[PDB]
From Swiss-Prot, chain B:
Protein name according to UniProt: Beta-galactosidase
Subunit structure and binding partners: Homotetramer.
Source organism superkingdom: Bacteria
Important for ensuring that an appropriate proportion of lactose is converted to allolactose, annotated site positions: 175
Native organism: Escherichia coli (strain K12)
Protein family per UniProt: Belongs to the glycosyl hydrolase 2 family.
Binding annotation for substrate: 175
Induction / repression: By allolactose.
């Protein structure tokens, strides 16, 4: 982020041309070339290299060629980079000094899914709701109202039920100068624990199931309470399609008087560990709602070890925003969400105070959040998060599609 | 366009798409739920293309067949307020005549919008949820076509426009786009829920 925000080259896309403005004051652009690439949902279509000849604090105009626009559904992204060909005394050959990305024309998906010939079968137990579709199987716990288990063949895929998560591991900016012996009432973590965010117990309100013509609909509605005061109300709709897709639509209502939650989304612990994570979204670095300018939208395939940022003081880390697709092992999640996946739970990151004392848990912890709250950074003793990055709307909605690839 | 009965409700799933010259601009997916108590639950999800210009409105539109003399809404009022001009309005219960719902601008344009509305009672109809509503005797197409307020004529029934999201009005100048980026409909995906019942 520091590298992207301190670039000596500013880019402005107008129509099809690109205005490049140098911020150098004394040197001429003699060791830089511009490399542009157009990608449809992570799949490249066209590319080219244009040398840069920019005067100090000057202007240059680059006229792009005919950009291919296919009729396939997706979003076209244009990414430009500045590459230094020769080796400077402080940089190697091929060093990138600046980059920028823009959203080109979008082709919305208007096609219809094929008719599901096979229909899901629903068994209504006294304490469970079990949906079977060939190899696929799901089991909802009627006592808790959450997705208790998923089955492919005879292998369990969930160690813990897929629940909601309105809390995160407190960051260094959230704690502030608050200790055990000194309590700062303005610190975000103290307001969260004072309102019972970390101690809220989910109470089941509604849990119904009914079969449709070609699908099975599960309607769940919970409420989080603390000392008789309701903080959050979550209403979820689960749809099992005959093609195998799980459509989860979640609506969250947050009280106005309670402190703004740091996270609105889901949480689970998968029973299978994988060595690769392939996500289409903003990356490949750790990015947040107030720190996503450096990240670029593309398809990134990275090992699970790089999903966890090795902060010595444990906190929330590894979040990737603007994620359009996420492939992990046999699981695929689609929609617009912010995901973080690691081997350590959020409660372990909260309890532990050193990274060397952290231990990898069974399975893999995954946190998919429809909405995430900022990190701040103006100072480490006062709330530094701007009002535009705080979860203060009151009503939130997000849709997830869970399938097996 | 599908319909199916539930254990205690009837679900209607509709999904449309707006196109122009072979290019899709907006995609609307609606879910209608008829409950046994009489409530209509309409959940609408709208997808807007990024390259197209930002729409000025995302919501519903209808023309009721009954005219009423009072409008009773719980929300921000009692004046005409907009997403960038709602600081003066206060949240309360306002009961006002239908004649005051239309601001008599001599040059016809969009008017009468009330933001932050939590409930809206008009005749036998009651709408609940979070929405921005404007109700008048003149359609939006008539306001577009007509250039004077004295040439406007009241149509049959009453035109109602309930919008989940509304875009700003500007006002810095009358010759350049004055609407700030925070008041523009540029998120891409929008969702709103309405409850229509008879009181």
């Amino acid at each position: 982020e520091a590298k992207h925000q301190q670039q000596f080259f500013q880019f402005r896309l107008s129509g099809q041309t690109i205005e490049v403005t140098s911020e150098y004051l004394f040197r001429h652009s003699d060791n830089e070339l511009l490399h542009w690439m157009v990608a449809l949902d992570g799949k490249p279509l066209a590319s080219g290299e244009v040398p840069l000849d920019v005067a100090p604090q000057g202007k240059q105009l680059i006229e792009l060629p005919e950009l291919p626009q296919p009729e396939s559904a997706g979003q076209l992204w244009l990414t430009v980079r500045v590459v230094q060909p020769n080796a400077t005394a402080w940089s190697e050959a091929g060093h990138i000094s600046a980059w920028q990305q823009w959203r080109l024309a979008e082709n919305l998906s208007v096609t219809l899914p094929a008719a599901s010939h096979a229909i899901p079968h629903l068994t209504t137990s006294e304490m469970d709701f079990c949906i079977e579709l060939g190899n696929k199987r799901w089991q909802f716990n009627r006592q808790s109202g959450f997705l208790s288990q998923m089955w492919i063949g005879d292998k369990k895929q969930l160690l813990t039920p897929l629940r909601d998560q309105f809390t995160r591991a407190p960051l260094d900016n959230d704690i502030g100068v608050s200790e055990a012996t000194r309590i700062d009432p303005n610190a975000w973590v103290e307001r969260w624990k004072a309102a019972g965010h970390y101690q809220a117990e989910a109470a089941l309100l509604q849990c119904t199931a009914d079969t449709l013509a070609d699908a099975v609909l599960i309607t769940t509605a919970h409420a989080w309470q603390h000392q008789g005061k309701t903080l959050f109300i979550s209403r979820k709709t689960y749809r099992i399609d005959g093609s195998g897709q799980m459509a989860i639509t979640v609506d969250v209502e947050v009280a106005s008087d309670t402190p703004h939650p740091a996270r609105i989304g889901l949480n689970c612990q998968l029973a299978q560990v994988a060595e690769r994570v392939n996500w289409l979204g903003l990356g490949p670095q750790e990015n947040y709602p107030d720190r996503l300018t450096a990240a670029c939208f593309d398809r990134w395939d990275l090992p699970l070890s790089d999903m966890y940022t090795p902060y010595v003081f444990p906190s929330e880390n590894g979040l990737r925003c603007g994620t359009r697709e996420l492939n992990y092992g046999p699981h695929q999640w689609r929609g617009d969400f912010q995901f973080n996946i690691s081997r350590y739970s959020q409660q372990q990151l909260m309890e532990t105070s050193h990274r060397h004392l952290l231990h990898a848990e069974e399975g893999t912890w995954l946190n998919i959040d429809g909405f995430h709250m900022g990190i701040g950074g103006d100072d480490s003793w006062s709330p530094s998060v701007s009002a535009e990055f705080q979860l203060s709307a009151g009503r939130y909605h997000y849709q997830l599609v869970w399938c097996q690839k």
